[PDB]
Amino acid sequence: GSDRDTPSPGGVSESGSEDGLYECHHCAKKFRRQAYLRKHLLAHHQALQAK
């Protein structure tokens, strides 16, 4: 927090996330945390490890 150059004001937005929430397509449930979305991505994985 003392950069010789301008840190550059990043004023963009990803369209699919919009707000920054990750909405899983084919589901209504969205997660703002990556870990929560990937746990849900594992909830798509029908094959249990300890079945």
Q: Residue 40 in contact with residue 31, Cβ under 8 Å?
A: yes
Cβ closest to Zn ion, residue 19 vs residue 29? 29
Determine, following the binding rule CB under 5 A, whether residue 37 of this chain makes contact with Zn ion: no
Q: How many residues bind Zn ion (CB under 5 A)?
A: 2
- Close Cβ partners of 12 (under 8 Å, ≥ 6 residues apart): none
In the shown chain, the binding pattern of residues 13 to 32 toward Zn ion, with x for contact by CB under 5 A and - for none, equals -----------x--x-----
Interface with Zn ion (CB under 5 A): 24, 27
